Structure formats: C-alpha cells, structure tokens
Design a protein around this nucleic acid. Structure first.
Ligand SMILES: Nc1ccn([C@H]2C[C@H](O)[C@@H](COP(=O)(O)OP(=O)(O)OP(=O)(O)O)O2)c(=O)n1
Ligand SMILES: [Ca+2]
Ligand SMILES: [Ca+2]
Lengths: 353, 959, 368
DNA sequence: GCTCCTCTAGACTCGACCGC
DNA sequence: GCGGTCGAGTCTAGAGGAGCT
C-alpha cells in the first residue's frame, strides 16, 4: 500500500513532499500536484476516454464550460460540468439539427470544497428522448464498465452497483476495489427534465426535440467519471517492484541507453534512433545522456519502477551489425534484433494490446 | 593669432601647423588672381556668405625629414621599400639551375640543388621566392602542392593530403595545414597564393610583402571594360599590340613573347579528383613549375618598367601595404552563415507558399466562365478532361448488434476494393482541374509528390499572371515573339474592359503612355503591347520580369503586384528582400577562414576579460587585386564594395561580422568626399591658385549637407529628383559622362520623361555646371579644363605622385578615343595616390612611435586598422595627422602652399569592434532582426572628433 | 470583422448569443465560451505547441500547477502559471540529474481580473538556463517561437515581434499579431534573473545549483508564456483573409483557410438519394476507416433533410472543411466517390480504396 | 558606347510506346 | 489497327566570371 505511493513519488508520478501527499488529499483533490509521469498518464487517460466516448460516435461533441460562473444567484467556481453543458442545449441542438438524441462531453476540473479541492472529471450528458431513457442509460453503463475494465489487469476489482436518489431517479455507480476498500470512481444518473426546465422557465417551444416526428423534451443523463481517481485506480492496479501499466496508458514506453564506448560514436546512433521513434509518436526516455552510467540491472530496475515497456541498449556491436538489446518489462526476457526493426516491433506491441 | 584666412574669406590652417608644414613666409597673393576669383564667386552668388569659423587647432607634428614634405614622403617610402627591392633585384640577377629531373614525393619542402637532386628542408631559407600554389577543389580548399623558385635553387612542397591517403581529415582549416614560409614573395594573383601561407594568418605582422605581377600588369598595360570587350572579341587597333588580358599566358606573351604556355586540358585540380592528382604528380608538378618560370620571366621583364612608369616610391610602398589585408573574424561568422541561409530558405518557402495560395484561389474563376474577364488568366488553358471510367429513435444496439453492424460495414467496404480491376492501370492526372493547373501540380505516382501546385516558381510564365503584376498600372503579358511586356488599355478574347477598369482604379488610387513601342504586330484586342525595358537595349526581349535588373523598378513602385489580395505584394517584397543573398551566397559562404589555435594567439588576446575558452577566431585574408583596373584601385567583389546593413536584405551585415579579437579594436575613419575634393582642388589650382576661386570648389568647402547648400542638394533641388539619383548624376558627370549618359539616366529614373524631355533637362543641367565650349562660363569649367588637359597630354601622369597612365590609353596609341575613360582615370588614380600616401604615412607613424597596429582593409575610401586596445587614441591621432599631411601634400604638389581647416582633419575617427559604416548602427536585417548588441554582444563605438582626440592623447603620439 | 464573428457564431466556433459577443469580451477572457469547432481548433493548437516544444526536446518536461493559489489569509485564483512552475524547480532537477539547461512546460487556465473575472488558456515554458548563455537561449527561443507562430499562418508577416526592456534592466521580447484594429500581445519571453528563485527558496542556496558543464551555478529563469485563446482567435482572423476581401470583385466565398494541422474537422462525408441501407453501410464503413486513422469526419450523411449543394459547400467552407466526400449510388458498382477540396473547389472522382491513403498523405505532408 | 564561355532553368517539339 | 500520351533534343534567356584554383 504505502510502497506503491512511495514509488509513485520517487518516479515523479505525484509531485510534492513525502509527508505533503496524503491518501485523503489524493482522493479529495487536495494534493500538491501531479508529477510529469502523472501528468502524462492523466493525458493518456483523457485521450483514451476521448477516443472511446467522443471519437467513435456521431452524436457527441465537445463542451466549453468555464470554471467561474458569474451569476448573481459574487461569482463562484463550478462544482459540476453538468450546468455548463445544459447551458449549451439551445446551442448544440442546432448542430444535430434538433434531432434527438444527442450528447455533449467535456473533460475539465471541478472545484469541490473540502480547503479548495479540484478534481479533473470526464462528464457526458445525453439528451435522451423520454421513451428510451433507461435503455440508453444501460447502454452507457455497459460501455463505461467495459471501457474501465479494458485496460485493467483484473476486471474483477472493477465493479458496479445500483442506487436511488432523493427524487426517485434510477442510477448506477461504479466502484473500483482499492486495497483498503471499495471506492467510487464513476456515477450514472437518469435525471429528468427539471434540470432543463429550471434553467429555462416557461416557453418550452425552444426546448423541443425531434424524436421521430413528434417534439419532446429530452431527459438528460449524467455520467461523471473522475479521471484523477481513475489514474489512482490504474496505478494501484499495476502494483520485484514493477508497475505493469497497460501499453495504451503508460507514459514512457522506450528506454534508450548506451553500453560500451566510445560515447561520441554511439551518441549519434542513439540520437538518430531517438528521433526516429519520436516521429512515430512513441515516448522514449533519453537515458543515453546520463554521464554516470549506472549498472544495467539498476537501470532496468529504475525502468521497471517507471513503467517502461521496452528498454533499448546500444553497444559496440550496433555500429557494425546493428544488434541492440531489447528487454521486455513484462517477461524480463532479453533479446536482440536489427536496429531498423525496432520501430515496427514497438508499434506492433502497442497496437496489439 | 591662430585665425588665418584666405583672400576669399576661407578659414585656412592655423599658424601653428601652417608654419610647421608649409614653412614661414609663404607667398603674397596676386591681386589679379584675387580679383578674378572674387568676380567668379560674385557671378555665382557665393561671395560674402557668412561662415562660422571652426576652433583653431594647436598641435606639435613630428619632425619632417628633408623638408617641403615631398622629400619627407620620399624618404619614408624609400626607407620602407628598400629591404624588398633589395630582394627583387637579387631575384632579377638569379642563376637558377635547370628544372629538376624528377620532383620528389614527400611532405614539406624539398630543396632541389644542382643537377636536380632532392634534399628535404624545413623551410625555404631565402629572402625572395616566385610562388604558385595548386589546391585540389574536390578535397575542399586546403593546398595540395606548391612550387617555388629561390634566387639560387628550385623548391617544391607536397601536402599531407597528397602524400598520405588517410581515412578522413578534419574539415576545419588550421595554420598547421598550410604552406610554412624582410621577405618578398612574387607571384601571379599572389593574393590567392598568399591565402595558403601559414604565417599570414597570425595577428602579429610578419614583415613579408607580396608583389603581384597581375597588379603591375594592370598598372603598366591595362585595358578598360570596353577595351577588354574589344580585345576579347577580336582575339585604330594600335593599342591591341601593346596590351593584354590578365591571363598568365597573355601576360607572358606580352612581356616575354616566348612560346605560349601549356595549360593541361585534364584540369585535375579544377575538375579531377584527388586520385587523378596522385597519379599525374610528375606532370602536374612540371606544369606548376612552367607557370612559376613564366611568372619569373614576367617579373624580370616587368619590375624595371613599372618603376620607370611609377617613379615615386610612395606608390610602390602603398602597393606593398595594400597586399597585406587582414579581416579578423570569430565564431559569429559561422552563425551568420547559418542564420542567413536558414532565413533565406524560410523566406523563399514563404514566397512559394504565397504563390501556391494565389494559384489555388485562381481555379475558382472557372465556375461561370469568370476567367474570361480576368486580365491575367484569360489566355491560359482552362479545359477540363472528362473522366474515363471504362423515423423514431430505434434505441441502443445490443452487445452483438453493434459488432454485426461494424462487420457488415467493413465487409461491404472491402467488397468495393474488387472494383479496382476496372480502374485503368495508369491513373489519370487530375481530370477535373483546369489545364494550366495540371502542369503545376505533380503527378500522384511521383515519389516526390507534394500537395497543391508544388512545381510553381517565379521563372514560369504563369507566375507574373497569378500575381497580377502591373507595370505602372498596366497588366503584364507574354508574347512568344517579343518576350514579356505590359498592356496599356483604351484601344478566348482578352478582357480589355477589365484592364481599363483596373487602370482607372490604379490611377484613382495613385498614346498617352510611351514605352518600348506600341508593337501593333502583337494584336491583343483593344490594347497596346509595350515591351519591358531590357538593360541590353530595345532590340532584346525580356524573358522574365523578376530578373535582377527590375529590382529598382519594383522598389520605385512601377512593377507592383496587382490589387485584390495581400499575397502578391508580399511575394514581391520577399523577392526584393532576398536578392543580395541569392546573388552572393556562393561567394560569402566559400570564404577561406583559418581558425587560429590558442597556441598561436598573442597573450594580449588570451588574457583579455572578453576572451572565452569556447570561441574560435579566424582571419579572412581578402584575395584583393591591389591594381584591379586601369585606375589602380583594388578590386574584390565580396568585400571591397558599397555594402551596408539594410532593414530589408537577408545576410547583408557581413561587414559587421569582421569583429576584432578581444584586446584589439578596429580604429578607422572614412574620407569626406575624397573624389569630389580632389576635383575641386585641381580646379582651384588650375584657375587662380587659391581655394574656393572656382564656384564649385567654394561650394565644396563652404557647403552644409543639413542646410542644403552642398552640391548634391542643389542638384536635386534644380532637377527635382531623389538624392541618390542626383548623387549618381554628379559623380557620373564629374567622371566625364556626356549628355547622352544624363539622358539615359533621366529616362531610366523617371519613366514620365520622354527622350526630348530628358535631353532638354540634361542640356540645362550641363549648361550651368560644366559650361560651354576649353569650357567657359560654368561652375566646374576650370576643373574640367584641367582634367581634359591632363588627359590629352602626351604622357598623362597623376599630378600628385607622377604615376603614368596605362600604355593602352596614352594618346599616341588611342587617337581621339576613350576620352571619358582617361578623364575618369585622372581623378580615380589621384584618389589611389591619396590612399597610398595615407598608408605610407600611417605605417611610418606606427613604426616610429611604436603603435601596435596593422592594416585591416581599405573598403573604398575607408581606412581601417586593427590597432591594439590600449593604443586606440594614439592611432586616432595618427589617422588625423596622416589625413592632414595627405591633404597638405595634395595642395603642395598642385602649387597651393596652404590648406583649409574645414578639410584638414577627419570628421570622426570611428573606434568600434566591427566594420559597420557608422558606430551608431545596429544592423537590423531580416537575417539579424535582434541587432548586433543582442545576438552577438557588440556594443557601440566612439566617433571622436579632432578636438576630443587631442584632449585624450594630450597631443603627443609618444607613449 | 463584424461578419467574421457572425460566421464564428453561426458555424459554432463561438458560443453565446449574438449581442453577448464583442471583441472586448473575446480579448478580456469573459466570453461565454468557444463553440465545439473552436474547442477542436484550440486542442489542435495546443497539440501543435506540445509537439513543437515538449515532444522533441530531450529536457522539457510537463508540470502540474493547481488552479487555486492557497495562502497569501485565504486563497486566490492563479493569474500566471509561472509561479507554479518555479516551485517544481528543485523537484524536477532530479529528472535531469541537476543538468542544465532544463525546462518545464504546461498548458492550463489563467484567471485575470477585468468587476468580472476573465479566463485565458496559456501555455508556458520556464527554461532554467545557466547565466552564461542567457542572451543566447533567449534569442534562440525567440526565433523558435516566432517561426512556430509564423509557419501555421497564411500571412507570417502579421505575426510581428518587438524587443522591450524591463524597468529593472532585464531584457525581453513580446510577440504580437496584427489584428484589423491593432496589435495584440500573444506571447512574451522575459529573461528573468535568479531573483524569483532566490526569493521563493530562501536560506541555503546550494539547492539551486545546476551542473552547467562542470561548474555549478544558479540557473537563469526564462519564461515563455503564450496566449492560446488569443492565438486561435488570431488564427481565425488570419484564415478569413480580411485584407483580400480586382480579381475577387465577384469571387467571394466565405472560407476559413485554417492550416491542415489546425483545422477542427478534416473531411465532410455525405450521401445521395438511394438505396438507403447499402449507402448507409458504405458511409459508416468509410467513417470508421477514416476515424481509425486519426482523421476527423463531419457526419453529414445522417441529415434527414437535404440542402442545395452550393449552400452545403458554403457551410462546409465556413467550417474549415478540407475535403467533401460524396458517396453516391454509383459507388456500389465501381467505387468512385466525388472529392471536392476546400483549397481549389474542384471535384475529383477518386477510388474509395485510395481515399484513406490520399488523405493521410495530404495531412502528413504539411509536417504531421 | 560594348563582347564571350559556360552553366541552369523553362517552353516547345518530334518521334516513338501501348492500351483498347 | 488506331489514337493519346511520354520523354530526349533544341532553342532561348538570365546567371556568374572576365583572375586562380
Ligand atoms: N554615386 C557615386 C557615389 C560615390 N562614388 C564613389 C566616389 C567616392 O569617392 C566614393 C565614396 O562615395 P560615397 O557615395 O560612399 O560617399 P559620398 O562621397 O557620396 O558622400 P555622401 O554619400 O555623404 O554624399 O565612391 C561614385 O563613384 N558614384
Ligand atoms: Ca597564383
Ligand atoms: Ca565618404
């Protein structure tokens, strides 16, 4: 439990002092910040969510909801991404040409008071016609559960449950199984039309839809998933101290290094391979620049704690026959291959998983 | 009573200097001469004008040996030129053995004693050598082999890159990769042979001077540009038998007259590779030896003749000092090259992008056949090739239904792939785009395909159509039988009405038009096709309106991109902004820079606080020809040209990159209207023997640039043209240009002037300045009379030094021909004599008072010196003293034993760390937008006057 | 300029009502929000900035600066993200093993008082250089940033620059853009000294030591803070080509010529008449094919209604749509689909199997 | 007031493939 | 068996120098 947090702190996943970072601050959005590896992991999670939710769908669109709400109600920071999305209902109705159903998705920070607490959340609002509200709710629940279980090493820990609110609206909530207990990471609510009627008192003419030929008032659906809490869950999922993150999420994938001398001769080869890999969108850790070359086993341990898919070693032979050591993090098996075959193999490994 | 004057109320020299230079007593002015000068001034309304006297300078000049200052200069020159003539004479009486049987194959120098015996030596142990060095161009520019002849032996040198075939040598030149040579090194174009000598790149001046047979040839028997053209065309021709070109073979033919020189047709040094040189060693060495012996014979037959035609030793000492030029450069030169080439490529790519964008917007005129109304795109090909085919909400899908839908879409998509069989084997190329657009866009199958019309360039005949170029508001047009040429409206059918509307819009925003001719043979409906003015004459057709000849026309606003967009004029301005680099990148980027190692630098530079252990300092020794024309002025295209950093030129700050090493400062100053004051003083000496007697000389002396009283300002006010145009006008007319030159200048500068108007204006301008016919009743009549009298004399010689005109220009051989060239030569060779006097006096001052400094460069009339940091003020005072003495000598040789104070000292002696024209410029260019003070770290420089110099130096050159 | 904002609202680049949008609101940061196409353009701009700066450099790292600024007796919303980056200097010196130069980068929101609080999305880069090469790194970054802002534009001359000096004597540069009304600041590079780090880290100064070569030294802090909201507004103003608006006297098409690496939606996919089922299947297959290769598509085939082809093309042009694919009935038998291009407005019938490769080649040829 | 040698880049041409 | 295209060859025009490699 504690060892994983220490590793994340040392490997620059969670920036801040050792005492400064606490579990409650992590879960309440009151942590000092994210380390560069944590920032890239969050960006990868955001990219994957954006793909799976907005990219391969023709009804979802991005949302630009500001942080402050300059409302007399003296402005306040936003607590939900839902209100900004609902402010765009009259605007984004024209994009789909008033054709129900349609959605609006956003990734952004929510200023939940605790001390100010900020969590980055990915929220989707689905303007369902009233007839099929529960059906689309189940559809989104199934898709979100499969997406959250896709990258996991054991979807058994990922779970789900039903619940009810004070109003009496059906809803399901997701709960990752953290080692200490079952903690929540996502929640789906089948809100009514009152969230839209309160913001638009009277004149329901502008709020109509085009379900079939009749015009209806869409029943919005709220699906909020805490991306930072998702990062925490996936980091706890991976955890020899090795964090076996999924290839599509890991921040650093390739560890380029040097072996025997001369340094000058191998520096050009390493830099060329580094540029080649970078141009293909594969992250590389520039370990060749390290003047004080540590032991190969120690370097491999550092890369294992850094969630690096493959470590590349360039030695004297590479200058002549182009053979480079390629260690696999998962199975700790060294192998050699031509330096021109590295890019294709890395792309294959990333795409396959 | 330091306030001396002139009978014309011109403030002359102070008594303290006038009694130390010209001696006491002087001469009582002739009352007749004073009366004539006063009457002449009254004729032009320049008599009695108040002039503010300058403060009188008190200074103690050093001892003048001999007296009269002429024997002084002669003694200085003789003391400077003695140890090198004592070696030239040793060479002229040599006993050189026959050529060696077989040239040795070893590194370094090998002394070939009697009977062609090879013996290795460390260095040539002689005080005189005729030199010729061969460098393989394939290997770069490092020297490969060299052959030199001593007064008593033959020598040869072979580099390590010709003896040892190493895997790879370094690409940076160093003194440890050059020829290891009072000494005299004769040669042909010895500047090329000098740049390959090791010791010539050290900061400390090794006392070695170079005699160039090419320079002596140009001094003795030289050819003007027209004479050179006639000589090349042929090979009234009496002068052809006495002159020759600068080729070593032609010079040897002219001076020796023996068998013609053998030039190897293999050209293994110019075209062949290093292996060819390694194989033909025994033949290339013999060819080089034959060239060396030809140079030796030319020198033998040339040295006495040059001395008999240029008797004053000042000329020879100045020529020896002009050979040793030195341009110190540092690591910022490589950065300058890189950031000029990158900024040239980026601007060229931006222009290409603008052209492609303007091409893309042109396709849309096809719809509705709107292109038939475009004045520029109406005559292109717009054909199109026909192609040759040969409910309610259903709800959420179930878990398997979505996969079923995806699979049934993917399989249906892949089923359409089977239709590729019907597709032709060779795909058609953009059948839907217009005809002119298919050519520009590359074929898809091409491996180097780029989106859009990627094959577009300024050279194509569509670019002046896309940009809608208008020449004085007239659209350009191309005809195959007459080249380019604009269309003047008012007279696929062309849209003449659209052209008329465009011209009306242009005239509102800013027959009747006369140009290269209506050319009714090319019938464009309702238009007149006037050709573009070509520089070669109206008998030739311009192939491209983007040629370098049209840049002034683009800047004047005549050739401008048409309206309707902001990408045409932007492309035109980008074209104007990269002309200099486009024309000079090969020259500037190929300069030979030898990076001196720290072991070769003096302790002054290696301990100065401005010295960093990660910087490289070099030396671009200019390959100058110390006598490059008939006028003996140095010629070097890269450096010795009128160049200065501009806000709209890429990589034009090269002269600002000549940065003195830490611990040294480039002291130097520019002469104020040297070639104008020389003509003025010649006229004054000829007319009445006093300064300001002629109205032209009086205007030159008592003239204020700010007040507009100067010559150029009055000329521009009278003719109503730009100041630069008036400056070129005045310099041309002074050099001897006739009225036809003035007419063509007026027609070129202003298109609204006809030939009649240009002739009238030229006649009116020449009838009040030069006078009437020799010449009488004009501002510059006496000066031109003196110049013509000097030119038409039996043996024209420069009045201030006695240097004779070239044999191919004396009036005996050329009878009544090339009068303009000789009258120009008078003034220009007088300026060259001025420069030689400056150099001799400066070297004397630097040697007697032990001022640590050396000559750097003499760009035009500028005179720079790489003086040590501590001796900058002493060097400035020395420059002022040398200018004073030079002007006094110029007046003394013309019979005027006096000198005006207003021209007796430098306006400002610039003291900076670069060769920028003024010490206040920041040299902001498209390549260097930040400025000198930020990109590199060069602060400004002092511009001390004479009074400020005296206080700093205490008035004494002694340390 | 008045028509450009109407186009941005209508084509959903800018949200809010027509009376609620003025250039003052856009520049101040108090606008109601950016339309979905504006959000996509801003994402593209941020991705290009990240590719230019963080991806290729071997030292630039990402950093996380919280929106709230706790303490000095309450909290406050952050105004600049520089102070957030300066706090990670000692933290991020371990990544480069105390080697210099190394930098930190971040893209985030900034709150600027205006009685209304505005917001701006600003991308910063705190670049800890040794004091020996401050005036070198500053000029290098000035050239790099000016090149980056100029390469995506239809008129790089508008993206000018200036060299203003600070009151205390520090040197710096301010980028600009020549909007129709005037020049507006979009990026600033201040060559700050070590004063900020010394003030933020009082006490023993051995922590603030970067191994420049072989000698330790307190680094010189360089801040490069660009405004991405005003950057994308400048790009929208530049692509519209207001100066262009004698040849275009009748030629008048309202087009946003955004750079292909910046345009929000790449291609528009349509359909014509019937059969409905097979054409829908073909369109969905092509949609998935293009999406799986990182090409955004506007699903124009889903529209139950139909508009005139010229009006549809004008709508796509105003939205910065590079290509307009039309899968007609004939595609089922030969695989030929019309392909209109935004740049030229000329139809080319390209085989459906070759569309993906051609689109990838066109997009990637513009440095993608 | 003008020539020449040589180099590259663009436009047009004649004569020969080869797809149908 | 026939007609549309593809590519070396020729003409033309601007580019540099009138040196030495
Ligand atoms: N149109 C010109 C200008 C100058 N020169 C020559 C003669 C001068 O001796 C030398 C330097 O002149 P500059 O033009 O550099 O400076 P000026 O003497 O003209 O002074 P200014 O430019 O201030 O008028 O160049 C020339 O031949 N033709
Ligand atoms: Ca020579
Ligand atoms: Ca001058």
């Amino acid at each position: 439990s504690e060892a994983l947090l220490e590793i994340c702190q040392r490997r620059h996943f969670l920036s801040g002092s050792k005492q400064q970072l606490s579990r409650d601050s992590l879960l309440s959005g009151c942590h000092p910040g994210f380390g560069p590896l944590g920032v890239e992991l969050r960006k990868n999670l955001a990219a994957e969510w954006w793909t799976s939710v907005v990219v391969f769908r023709e009804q979802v669109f991005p949302v630009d909801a500001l942080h402050h709400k300059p409302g007399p109600l003296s402005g306040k920071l936003r607590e939900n991404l839902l209100h900004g999305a609902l402010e765009h209902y009259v605007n984004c109705l024209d994009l789909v040409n008033k054709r129900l159903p349609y959605g609006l998705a956003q990734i952004g920070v929510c200023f939940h008071p605790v001390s100010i607490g900020e969590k980055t959340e990915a929220s989707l609002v689905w303007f369902t016609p009233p007839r099929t509200s529960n059906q689309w709710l189940d559809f989104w629940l199934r898709h979100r559960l499969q997406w959250w279980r896709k990258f996991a090493m054991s979807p058994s820990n990922f779970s789900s449950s039903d619940c009810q609110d004070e109003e009496g609206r059906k809803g399901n909530k997701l709960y990752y199984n953290f080692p200490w207990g079952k903690e929540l990471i996502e929640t789906l609510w089948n809100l009514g039309d009152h969230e839209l009627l309160h913001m638009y008192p009277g004149n329901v003419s502008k709020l109509h839809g085009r379900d079939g030929r009749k015009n209806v008032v869409p029943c919005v659906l709220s699906v909020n998933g805490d991306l930072d809490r998702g990062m925490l869950a996936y980091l706890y999922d991976s955890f020899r101290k090795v964090l076996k993150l999924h290839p599509c999420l890991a921040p650093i994938k390739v560890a380029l290094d040097v072996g025997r001398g001369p340094t000058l001769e191998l520096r050009q080869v390493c830099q060329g391979l580094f540029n080649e890999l970078l141009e293909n969108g594969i992250s590389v850790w520039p370990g060749y620049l390290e003047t004080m070359q540590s032991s190969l086993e120690q370097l491999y341990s550092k890369y294992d704690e850094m969630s690096i898919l493959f470590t590349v070693l360039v030695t004297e032979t590479t200058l002549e026959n182009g053979l480079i050591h390629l260690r696999s993090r998962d199975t700790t098996m060294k192998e050699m291959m031509h330096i021109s075959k590295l890019k294709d193999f890395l792309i294959k490994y990333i795409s396959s998983a | 009573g330091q306030l001396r004057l002139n009978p014309l109320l011109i403030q002359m020299l102070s008594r303290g200097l006038h009694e130390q230079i010209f001696g006491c007593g002087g001469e009582m002015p002739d009352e007749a001469a004073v009366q004539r000068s006063v009457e002449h001034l009254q004729k032009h309304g320049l008599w009695g004008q108040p002039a503010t006297p300058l403060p009188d300078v008190e200074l103690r000049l050093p001892r003048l040996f001999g007296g009269n200052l002429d024997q002084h200069f002669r003694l200085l020159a003789q003391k400077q030129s003695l140890p090198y003539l004592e070696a030239a004479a040793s060479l002229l009486e040599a006993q050189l053995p026959p050529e060696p049987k077989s040239w040795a194959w070893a590194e370094g120098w090998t002394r070939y004693g009697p009977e062609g015996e090879a013996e290795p030596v460390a260095i040539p142990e002689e005080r005189a050598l005729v030199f010729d060095v061969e460098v393989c161009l394939a290997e770069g520019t490092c020297p490969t082999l060299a052959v030199a002849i001593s007064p008593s032996a033959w020598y040869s040198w072979c580099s390590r890159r010709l003896v040892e075939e190493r895997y790879s040598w370094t690409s940076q030149l160093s003194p440890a990769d050059l020829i290891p040579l009072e000494q005299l090194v004769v040669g042909h174009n010895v500047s090329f042979d000098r740049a390959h000598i090791r010791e010539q790149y050290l900061i400390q001046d090794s006392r070695m001077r170079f005699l160039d047979t090419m320079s002596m040839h140009m001094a003795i028997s030289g050819l003007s540009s027209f004479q050179r053209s006639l000589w090349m065309g042929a090979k009234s021709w009496d002068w052809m038998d006495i002159s020759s070109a600068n080729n070593l073979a032609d010079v040897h033919n002219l001076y020796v007259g023996g068998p013609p020189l053998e030039k190897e047709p293999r050209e293994l040094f110019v075209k062949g590779s290093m292996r060819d040189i390694r194989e033909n060693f025994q033949d290339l060495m013999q060819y080089c030896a034959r060239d060396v012996w030809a140079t030796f014979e030319v020198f033998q037959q040339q040295l006495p003749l040059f001395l008999e035609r240029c008797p004053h030793p000042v000329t020879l000492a100045g020529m020896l000092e002009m050979g040793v030029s030195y341009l110190p450069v540092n690591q910022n030169w490589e950065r300058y090259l890189t950031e000029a080439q990158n900024t040239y490529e980026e601007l060229q790519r931006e222009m290409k992008k603008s052209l492609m964008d303007l091409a893309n917007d042109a396709c849309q005129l096809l719809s509705g056949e709107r292109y038939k109304e475009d004045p520029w795109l109406w005559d292109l090909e717009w054909d199109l090739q026909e192609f040759k085919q040969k409910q309610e909400d259903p709800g959420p899908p179930s878990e398997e239904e979505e996969l079923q839908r995806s699979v049934t879409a993917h399989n249906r998509l892949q089923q359409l792939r089977s239709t590729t069989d019907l597709l032709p084997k060779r795909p058609q190329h953009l059948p839907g785009h217009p005809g002119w657009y298919r050519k520009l866009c590359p074929r898809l199958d091409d491996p180097a395909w780029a989106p859009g019309p990627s094959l577009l360039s300024l050279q194509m005949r569509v670019t002046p159509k896309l940009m809608a170029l208008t020449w004085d508001g007239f659209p350009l047009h191309y005809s195959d039988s007459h080249g380019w040429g604009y269309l003047v409206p008012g007279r696929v059918t062309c849209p003449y009405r659209a052209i008329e509307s465009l011209y009306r819009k242009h005239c509102l925003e800013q027959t009747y038009h006369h140009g290269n001719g209506p050319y009714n043979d090319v019938n464009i409906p309702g238009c007149w096709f006037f050709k573009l003015p070509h520089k070669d004459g109206n008998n030739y057709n311009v192939g491209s309106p983007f040629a370098k000849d049209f840049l002034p026309k683009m800047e004047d606003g005549t050739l401008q991109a048409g309206p309707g967009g902001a990408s045409g004029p932007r492309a035109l301005e980008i074209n104007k902004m990269i002309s200099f680099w486009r024309n000079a990148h090969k020259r500037i980027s190929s300069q030979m820079v030898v990076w001196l190692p720290r072991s070769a630098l003096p302790r002054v530079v290696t301990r100065h606080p401005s010295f960093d252990e990660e910087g490289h300092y070099g030396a671009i020794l200019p390959q100058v020809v110390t006598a490059g024309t008939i006028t003996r002025r140095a010629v070097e295209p890269t450096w010795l040209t009128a160049s200065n950093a501009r806000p709209d030129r890429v990589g034009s700050e090269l002269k600002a990159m000549v940065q003195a090493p830490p611990g040294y400062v480039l002291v130097g100053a520019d002469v104020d209207s040297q070639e104008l004051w020389i003509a003025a003083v010649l006229g004054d000496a000829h007319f009445a023997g006093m300064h300001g007697c002629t109205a032209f000389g009086w205007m030159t002396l008592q003239g204020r640039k700010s007040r507009g009283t100067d010559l150029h300002s009055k000329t521009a006010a009278t003719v109503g043209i730009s100041r630069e145009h008036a400056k070129i006008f005045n310099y041309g007319r002074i050099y001897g240009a006739g009225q036809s030159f003035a007419e063509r200048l007026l027609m070129q500068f202003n298109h609204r002037l006809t030939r009649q108007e240009a002739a009238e204006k030229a006649q009116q301008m020449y009838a009040v300045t030069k006078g009437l016919r020799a010449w009488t009743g004009g501002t510059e009549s006496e000066m031109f009379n003196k110049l013509e009298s000097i030119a038409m004399s039996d043996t024209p010689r420069t009045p201030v030094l006695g240097c004779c005109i070239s044999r191919a220009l004396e009036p005996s051989v050329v009878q009544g021909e090339f009068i303009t060239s000789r009258v120009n030569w008078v003034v220009q060779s007088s300026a060259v004599d001025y420069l030689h006097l400056m150099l001799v006096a400066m070297k004397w001052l630097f040697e007697e008072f032990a001022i640590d400094g050396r000559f750097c460069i003499s760009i035009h009339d500028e005179v720079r010196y790489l003086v040590r940091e501590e001796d900058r003020y002493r060097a400035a005072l020395a420059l002022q003293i040398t200018n004073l003495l030079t002007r006094c000598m110029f007046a003394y040789k013309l019979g005027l034993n006096d000198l005006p104070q207003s021209v007796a000292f430098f306006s400002a002696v610039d003291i900076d760390q670069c060769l920028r024209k003024e010490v206040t410029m920041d040299c902001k260019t498209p390549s260097n937008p930040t400025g000198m003070e930020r990109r590199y770290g060069i602060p400004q420089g002092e511009a001390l006057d004479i009074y400020q110099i005296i206080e700093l130096t205490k008035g004494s050159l002694e340390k």
